[PDB]
């Protein structure tokens, strides 16, 4: 119920299902964005995953244990968004990040646009390590989107 991989986060009511986001299972911990689940418990097969840590300002939450993803963008190399859009198979999109320049340092940022339920899709370095999650960002003047590469602290 916690095998490594990328997962869709779904909700179902009486009718069908809706994909509200995506997350990463690594080292027995599920990692996603706070705005996807709001820390609600997650069903995985017959099991239940409970929130362990989170931070609304970082827009991150982990389940079952502390945040495990610690790879960092090197500030130089191209990366891949492993986008998992609703209703579409996972696909890798290679890009050279831009930068969010903030008063508290710079953050890599990817100019790729996907539906809201793609939130939490992992961004990867060339070694396949998860350098952050996609889906907390800004809209620029032409209407397109730029997502921070949001990484937690391990």
């Amino acid at each position: 119920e916690t095998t490594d991989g990328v997962y869709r986060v779904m909700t179902r009511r009486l009718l069908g299902s809706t994909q509200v986001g995506v997350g990463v299972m690594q080292e027995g911990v599920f990692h996603t964005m706070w705005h996807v689940t709001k820390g609600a418990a997650l069903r995985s097969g017959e099991g239940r995953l409970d929130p362990y840590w989170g931070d609304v300002k970082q827009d991150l939450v982990s389940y079952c244990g502390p945040w495990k993803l610690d790879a960092a963008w090197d500030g130089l190399s191209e990366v891949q968004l492993l986008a998992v859009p609703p209703g579409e198979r996972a696909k890798n999109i290679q890009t050279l990040p831009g930068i969010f320049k903030t008063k508290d340092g710079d953050i890599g940022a990817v100019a790729l646009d996907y539906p809201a339920g793609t939130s939490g899709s992992p961004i990867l370095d060339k070694c396949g390590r998860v350098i952050g999650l996609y889906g907390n960002g800004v809209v620029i003047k032409n209407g397109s989107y730029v997502s921070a590469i949001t990484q937690g602290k391990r």
Binding site: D4, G5, Y7, R12, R13, T37, L82, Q94, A109, C127
Partner: protein, 40 residues
């Protein structure tokens, strides 16, 4: 509300992939609620 997860794939880098998108350099601020905004 039943919130659940389902596997979608293995986390792997794709060799010879589509390189797309630009690399914007933006001045942004982050509020305590986790919202980024452009500095004007």
């Amino acid at each position: 509300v039943d919130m659940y997860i389902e596997r979608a794939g293995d986390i792997t880098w794709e060799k010879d992939a589509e390189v797309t998108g630009n690399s914007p350099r933006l001045d942004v601020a982050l509020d305590e609620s986790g919202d980024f905004s452009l500095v004007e």
